[PDB]
Enzyme design. Structure first.
Site, PDB file in Angstrom:
ATOM      1  N   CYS D 107      -2.465 122.673  29.295  1.00  0.00           N
ATOM      2  CA  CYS D 107      -1.931 123.685  30.161  1.00  0.00           C
ATOM      3  C   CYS D 107      -1.356 124.750  29.189  1.00  0.00           C
ATOM      4  O   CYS D 107      -0.201 124.681  28.741  1.00  0.00           O
ATOM      5  CB  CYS D 107      -0.836 123.121  31.119  1.00  0.00           C
ATOM      6  SG  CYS D 107      -0.303 124.479  32.270  1.00  0.00           S
ATOM      7  N   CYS D 110       1.863 126.483  30.598  1.00  0.00           N
ATOM      8  CA  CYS D 110       3.073 125.715  30.955  1.00  0.00           C
ATOM      9  C   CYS D 110       2.967 124.211  30.576  1.00  0.00           C
ATOM     10  O   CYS D 110       3.294 123.841  29.432  1.00  0.00           O
ATOM     11  CB  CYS D 110       3.502 125.790  32.418  1.00  0.00           C
ATOM     12  SG  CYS D 110       2.335 125.591  33.619  1.00  0.00           S
ATOM     13  N   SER D 111       2.526 123.391  31.514  1.00  0.00           N
ATOM     14  CA  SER D 111       2.598 121.935  31.315  1.00  0.00           C
ATOM     15  C   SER D 111       1.817 121.059  32.258  1.00  0.00           C
ATOM     16  O   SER D 111       1.934 119.793  32.202  1.00  0.00           O
ATOM     17  CB  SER D 111       4.058 121.479  31.395  1.00  0.00           C
ATOM     18  OG  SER D 111       4.809 121.938  32.550  1.00  0.00           O
ATOM     19  N   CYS D 112       1.040 121.690  33.140  1.00  0.00           N
ATOM     20  CA  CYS D 112       0.333 121.137  34.256  1.00  0.00           C
ATOM     21  C   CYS D 112      -0.426 119.914  33.843  1.00  0.00           C
ATOM     22  O   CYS D 112      -1.133 119.891  32.793  1.00  0.00           O
ATOM     23  CB  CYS D 112      -0.530 122.212  34.872  1.00  0.00           C
ATOM     24  SG  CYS D 112       0.515 123.607  35.218  1.00  0.00           S
TER      25      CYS D 112
HETATM   26 CO   LIG Z   1       1.535 123.674  33.258  1.00  0.00          CO
END
Ligand SMILES: [Co+2]
Ligand SMILES: [Cl-]
Ligand SMILES: [Cl-]
Ligand SMILES: [Co+2]
Ligand SMILES: [Mg+2]
Ligand SMILES: [Mg+2]
Lengths: 202, 227, 227, 202
Positions: D107, D110-112
């Site tokens: 991601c 972000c961090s998905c």
């Molecule tokens: Co993310």
């Protein structure tokens, strides 16, 4: 410090201060620097140079049309002739504000600024807000400084990506009739020679 | 390098902290004055850096978190440190030990030494400067008025090709001459001068913003192609 | 927004801090656990955020210096704060006063309260989720195998169009369906669903690196044009 | 703090901790949250979910070809049937590693990460080094994890820019003959289901 996240922890400003003193001390001990060499530099950049040099150039251009024309045709030769030359001012170009063209200067990548002519750059000139935004939304940035240009004035932003340097020649304001060259020079602001302000009538 | 330093066109950095010029003081701490002396002093003698290219890459190599918090002359201390260690002028452990000494006892006195001949030497750099203009045998690839397309390249070393200007059409404004090439000189690989151009780019091309703005950027020949 | 969060293709962030999985602990501080409860808890009730779009923009609006130093769940606390204040659920001064209370006395006790019906409600979000898939009357502009050119656009609000993928040729891999559109939903402007595509991009196109790498990116229809 | 430079000073982590408690306290006082709601969430993400769910999926695919084929043809239907569905796992796609195709998930923005199937992402998955670099130099990044792929293996990086989520199905290693499904599942590492590692023969 969790070692998964060393990058979340900046060096404190005390670190950089310490490191500055360590480098100064080691270099002096190894014969690479001296107290007086450091002081000569500090004296040159904190006291000898400054935006008054450019203000004198601007006032001359306003008062002497033949000089203005020479300056715009070949600024490097002219500026060198006047003595405004040196480190980070070996190649200085002058860009003229006109009624429908406004010039603004930036160093997006760092801080590049012509020290021999204008002295040290503004605090804000070196910081990310101005550098990021001026090339993309110069009208918004100029409004922050109190310069609100009409849509029909073209803006030219000059990004100092090489050693070539740029100084803005601002226009002489109204209300200055019969002022002398010296008096005109005192009206020239540093900010006008970057392009973030016009000069106010006195 | 596509680093934190290359901020042109970024969002989120906030308002410009305007200060009247007469209030915009140059230095608030003596270590900042020292930083200036260190950079000019070393460069005047070719120590760690022969010109600004090596100086700039040492700043660009900072941890992004340090670049954003060090304050400006923090960057100068970072690059001085980097380049002196990299060229073997200073030993890294010796410099770390001494930093720690001054950290724990910030009143430790700096040794004094007077060297007027070094002052002369430094004055020369200040007034004579370090012009990168060279002559080369080749002819410029591009001419004034020519429409070019900047390349889509991503140097992992130093470059002066800002990311916002990559893979963009522009128009040659001026052919300066050949200048020492930063992407090489920053890494101590030779002046290898290349023609330098001023190039105009329209807002519509850079940003997709139809409006009366343009950016003029100086680009070395190798950053660009003919159309 | 072209912010610090949009890091794809940046240089200078350093090595990946590998840790064996069994050593890679989830939470080291109770406030991090609280952050998780806060985000899920609010979102389950539509408070400050109906889905993840509003959540993401609050993180992207962080001061870059905070984004890089807060730690991960710092971002979650930042966005919860942002969106509750922005929607009027929480007053900004009331929240600042109370922060200061806990700052000065970090042993202040949090009020307790049991609400099993709220637990049920939260369980629903956990297990039922918040699928953004919608139906729309329009037909997809693009088809699988089609070569497209992504736009050169620079939204100042939230987008899911990473900068490294802008103004690039790619090839439609899949037409997912129409999904709630983030650039609008993040700013509370309507689901306004748009067709979502998976798009393949070649290394040579993204980076100019001739090599056997590709990136697959999900892009909404409005991020792209036909060739 | 010099007010020209407020941006050089990050909020200390004590600030975020304080703010977390303030939000929790105000929301509980205003009837928007409860002690047990917060605890239910924490229990779900710290204890109930985890990479064992995906490991079970991978072991099933290795041991049952009809299931593997169904999973690859329509993973969302299959995964939902198994119960691996929920918040941030409403649309999960499975991407198969093969001898000449290696898949790695990120991601960048972000961090998905698909919590219902794999639990919470690695520490490093959320941090800038992996996110910046994997899309551009995935071979270099994989070498850091001890995966050194030959030039002829194609790498496909999947950037989780929408709510669609991706899980890598790693190949079954040598040396596993006659192991049961349950035994095979214990070999499946979290890192293999992101694509940063292959599975070692036992
Ligand atoms: Co993310
Ligand atoms: Cl003007
Ligand atoms: Cl594998
Ligand atoms: Co600069
Ligand atoms: Mg330049
Ligand atoms: Mg996605």
């Amino acid at each position: 410090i969790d070692p998964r996240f060393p990058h979340h922890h900046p060096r404190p400003q005390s670190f950089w201060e310490a490191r500055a003193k360590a480098l100064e001390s080691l270099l002096i001990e190894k014969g690479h620097l001296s107290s007086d060499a450091s002081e000569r530099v500090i004296k040159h950049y904190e006291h000898e140079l400054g935006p008054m040099n450019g203000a004198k150039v601007v006032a001359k251009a306003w008062t002497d049309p033949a000089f203005k024309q020479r300056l715009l045709e070949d600024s490097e030769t002219v500026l060198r002739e006047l003595g405004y030359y040196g480190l980070q001012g070996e190649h200085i170009r002058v860009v003229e504000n006109t009624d429908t063209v406004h010039n603004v200067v930036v160093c997006t990548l760092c801080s590049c600024y012509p020290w021999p002519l204008l002295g040290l750059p503004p605090s804000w000139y070196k910081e990310p807000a101005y550098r990021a935004r001026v090339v993309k939304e110069p009208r918004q940035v100029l409004k922050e400084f109190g310069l609100d240009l009409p849509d029909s004035v073209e803006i030219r932003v000059w990004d100092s990506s090489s050693e070539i340097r740029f100084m803005v020649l601002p226009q002489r304001p109204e209300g200055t009739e019969g002022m002398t060259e010296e008096e005109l020079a005192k009206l020239v602001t540093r900010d006008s020679m970057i392009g973030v302000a016009k000069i106010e009538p006195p | 390098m596509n680093g934190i330093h290359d901020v042109g066109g970024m969002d989120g950095f906030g308002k410009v902290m305007y200060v009247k010029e007469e209030e915009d003081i140059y230095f608030t701490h003596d270590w900042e004055r020292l930083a200036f002396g260190l950079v000019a002093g070393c460069m005047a003698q070719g120590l760690g850096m022969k010109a600004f290219d090596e100086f700039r890459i040492g700043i660009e190599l900072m941890r992004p978190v340090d670049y954003l918090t060090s304050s400006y002359y923090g960057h100068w201390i970072a690059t001085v440190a980097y380049n002196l260690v990299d060229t073997g002028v200073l030993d890294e452990k010796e410099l770390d030990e001494r930093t720690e000494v001054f950290l724990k006892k910030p009143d430790t006195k700096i040794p004094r030494r007077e060297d007027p001949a070094l002052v002369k030497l430094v004055e020369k750099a200040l007034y004579d400067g370090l012009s990168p203009l060279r002559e080369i045998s080749a002819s410029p690839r591009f001419k004034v008025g020519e429409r070019i397309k900047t390349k889509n390249i991503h140097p992992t070393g130093h470059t002066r090709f800002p990311r916002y200007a990559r893979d963009k059409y522009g128009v040659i404004d001026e052919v300066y001459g050949a200048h020492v090439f930063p992407d090489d000189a920053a890494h101590r690989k030779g002046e290898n001068p290349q023609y330098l151009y001023r190039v105009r780019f329209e807002a519509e091309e850079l940003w997709g913003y139809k409006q009366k703005d343009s950016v003029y950027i100086d680009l070395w020949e190798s950053y660009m192609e003919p159309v």
